[PDB]
Write an enzyme that holds these catalytic residues in place. Structure first.
Site, mmCIF file in Angstrom:
data_model
loop_
_atom_site.group_PDB
_atom_site.id
_atom_site.type_symbol
_atom_site.label_atom_id
_atom_site.label_comp_id
_atom_site.label_asym_id
_atom_site.label_seq_id
_atom_site.Cartn_x
_atom_site.Cartn_y
_atom_site.Cartn_z
ATOM 1 C CD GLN A 1 3.116 39.363 44.894
ATOM 2 O OE1 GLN A 1 3.139 40.528 44.500
ATOM 3 N NE2 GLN A 1 3.519 38.343 44.142
ATOM 4 C CG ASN B 1 13.605 50.097 41.047
ATOM 5 O OD1 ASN B 1 12.932 49.476 40.223
ATOM 6 N ND2 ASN B 1 13.072 50.690 42.112
ATOM 7 N NE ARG C 1 3.026 57.778 62.037
ATOM 8 C CZ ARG C 1 2.104 57.386 62.917
ATOM 9 N NH1 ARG C 1 2.146 56.164 63.452
ATOM 10 N NH2 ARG C 1 1.130 58.221 63.262
ATOM 11 C CG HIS D 1 5.944 45.450 61.723
ATOM 12 N ND1 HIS D 1 5.384 46.479 62.449
ATOM 13 C CD2 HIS D 1 5.264 44.331 62.073
ATOM 14 C CE1 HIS D 1 4.407 46.004 63.199
ATOM 15 N NE2 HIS D 1 4.313 44.704 62.987
ATOM 16 C CG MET E 1 5.158 45.564 74.453
ATOM 17 S SD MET E 1 3.604 45.112 75.253
ATOM 18 C CE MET E 1 2.449 45.491 73.937
ATOM 19 C CD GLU F 1 5.592 42.293 66.116
ATOM 20 O OE1 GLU F 1 5.236 42.620 67.257
ATOM 21 O OE2 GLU F 1 4.808 42.266 65.147
HETATM 22 C C1 LIG Z 1 -1.064 49.780 33.815
HETATM 23 C C2 LIG Z 1 0.377 50.163 33.484
HETATM 24 C C3 LIG Z 1 0.752 49.438 32.192
HETATM 25 C C4 LIG Z 1 0.457 51.680 33.233
HETATM 26 O O1 LIG Z 1 -0.736 52.343 33.666
HETATM 27 C C5 LIG Z 1 1.660 52.333 33.878
HETATM 28 C C6 LIG Z 1 1.630 52.162 35.396
HETATM 29 C C7 LIG Z 1 1.526 50.695 35.853
HETATM 30 C C8 LIG Z 1 0.305 50.577 36.782
HETATM 31 C C9 LIG Z 1 2.883 50.301 36.560
HETATM 32 C C10 LIG Z 1 3.218 51.087 37.825
HETATM 33 O O2 LIG Z 1 2.603 52.081 38.178
HETATM 34 C C11 LIG Z 1 4.330 50.586 38.641
HETATM 35 C C12 LIG Z 1 5.023 49.469 38.393
HETATM 36 C C13 LIG Z 1 6.104 49.058 39.395
HETATM 37 C C14 LIG Z 1 7.446 49.767 39.129
HETATM 38 C C15 LIG Z 1 8.540 49.483 40.180
HETATM 39 C C16 LIG Z 1 9.852 49.126 39.469
HETATM 40 C C17 LIG Z 1 8.795 50.639 41.139
HETATM 41 O O3 LIG Z 1 8.072 51.719 40.946
HETATM 42 O O4 LIG Z 1 9.603 50.518 42.046
HETATM 43 C C18 LIG Z 1 8.106 48.328 41.093
HETATM 44 C C19 LIG Z 1 7.510 47.169 40.318
HETATM 45 C C20 LIG Z 1 6.237 47.519 39.534
HETATM 46 C C21 LIG Z 1 5.025 46.944 40.278
HETATM 47 C C22 LIG Z 1 6.324 46.903 38.134
HETATM 48 C C23 LIG Z 1 5.078 47.156 37.307
HETATM 49 C C24 LIG Z 1 4.726 48.647 37.134
HETATM 50 C C25 LIG Z 1 5.618 49.204 36.027
HETATM 51 C C26 LIG Z 1 3.187 48.781 36.787
HETATM 52 C C27 LIG Z 1 2.337 48.201 37.934
HETATM 53 C C28 LIG Z 1 2.859 47.979 35.518
HETATM 54 C C29 LIG Z 1 1.482 48.308 34.942
HETATM 55 C C30 LIG Z 1 1.436 49.792 34.576
HETATM 56 ZN ZN LIG Z 2 3.083 43.417 64.099
HETATM 57 ZN ZN LIG Z 3 4.199 41.765 43.335
#
Ligand SMILES: CC1(C)[C@@H](O)CC[C@]2(C)[C@H]3C(=O)C=C4[C@@H]5C[C@@](C)(C(=O)O)CC[C@]5(C)CC[C@@]4(C)[C@]3(C)CC[C@@H]12
Ligand SMILES: [Zn+2]
Ligand SMILES: [Zn+2]
EC number: 4.4.1.5
Lengths: 182, 170
Positions: free
Chosen positions: A32, A102, A121, A125, A156, A171
């Site tokens: 992904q 969100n 930066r 892309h 290009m 791209e």
């Molecule tokens: C370890 C723990 C439990 C904790 O240490 C808090 C930070 C964190 C590392 C936490 C983070 O930092 C950012 C996000 C993101 C928030 C979001 C909605 C965004 O910021 O746009 C995008 C999706 C995403 C990946 C969902 C999951 C969480 C909540 C994510 C990884 C879940 C795991 C989490």
């Molecule tokens: Zn490229």
């Molecule tokens: Zn993901």
């Protein structure tokens, strides 16, 4: 022969920074690429109708107030009906696009995501390989898509960049024509 | 969901051979980055392309058998750019010697790109191997609500999800 360091890596330096893969990483999959999206309607419509991707799955996180949309170039008649089944499949697809909405960002005229191509930066892309850049882009023009670089602009020729509704660059390239272009 | 109409079922058949070929990330220092993606993560360097006039290089990495790569530059190029799910790491010459330069990972102000993601058989043993190789974690598999799911960081600090597709299933 190590290059002046304002001149980039020689092939030798570069290649010698490469190791053959540990066999425990066989079966590893690049599954992904996640992008944050302001408005899931504009975005799902852009990726499915314009670009032709299939919406594999949507995941909801009502507590944390956000949703995930998983899209890929896959046949809809491969998508399992069963929930668990469907998730295992979706998440075992190669080359998938994860869009993170969100809740509320669509109504927020003050809010926009940064596309990584101006300071600061980073991400640049994603890119789609097509059999004909000019025909694809002609249709994109017909469909109202916004362009960063038209296929004929610049040195290009035959390669294009369009924007998605969040400004992210995409791209558009023809693998059988790239070597001519470079 | 009122996004009920937003999902074009049956895409126009002119898009039927379209293929998600690449994700591009800018990298400060390909010595580190190449080491990391090949040795730690197990990808293969498909092709190195240089642009002197423009002062940058591109490194295409993917999960591909090195033996499938054509040796000839034109055949190689055509093959590389038709692979599915490649990482295109862009190197603007000199950034590795610019002590004041660094790229932004998209996960703090200003946000956008979040992460790429790698599916593995066994999140725990992959992450234990990662620990042993001094990989920096953003999230260990055993922190928070999501257990059995990790995020690591590459040499530029880009986030990389380590997941098992049968465990999100739960
Ligand atoms: C370890 C723990 C439990 C904790 O240490 C808090 C930070 C964190 C590392 C936490 C983070 O930092 C950012 C996000 C993101 C928030 C979001 C909605 C965004 O910021 O746009 C995008 C999706 C995403 C990946 C969902 C999951 C969480 C909540 C994510 C990884 C879940 C795991 C989490
Ligand atoms: Zn490229
Ligand atoms: Zn993901």
């Amino acid at each position: 022969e190590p290059q002046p360091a304002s001149s980039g890596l020689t092939d030798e330096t570069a290649f010698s920074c490469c190791s053959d893969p540990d066999p425990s990483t066989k079966d590893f999959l690049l599954q992904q690429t996640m992008l944050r999206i302001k408005d899931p309607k504009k975005s799902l419509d852009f990726y499915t109708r314009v670009l032709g991707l299939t919406l594999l799955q949507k995941l909801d996180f009502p507590a944390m107030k956000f949703s995930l949309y998983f899209l890929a170039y896959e046949d809809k008649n491969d998508i399992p009906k069963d929930k668990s089944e469907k998730t295992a499949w979706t998440f075992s697809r190669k080359a998938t696009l994860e869009l993170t909405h969100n809740w509320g960002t669509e109504d927020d005229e003050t809010q926009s995501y940064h596309n990584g191509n101006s300071d600061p930066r980073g991400f640049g892309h994603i890119g789609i390989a097509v059999p004909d850049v000019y025909s694809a882009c002609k249709r994109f023009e017909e469909l109202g898509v916004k362009f960063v670089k038209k296929p004929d602009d610049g040195k290009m020729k035959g390669l294009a960049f369009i924007q998605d509704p969040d400004g992210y660059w995409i791209e558009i390239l023809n693998p059988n024509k790239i070597a001519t272009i470079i």
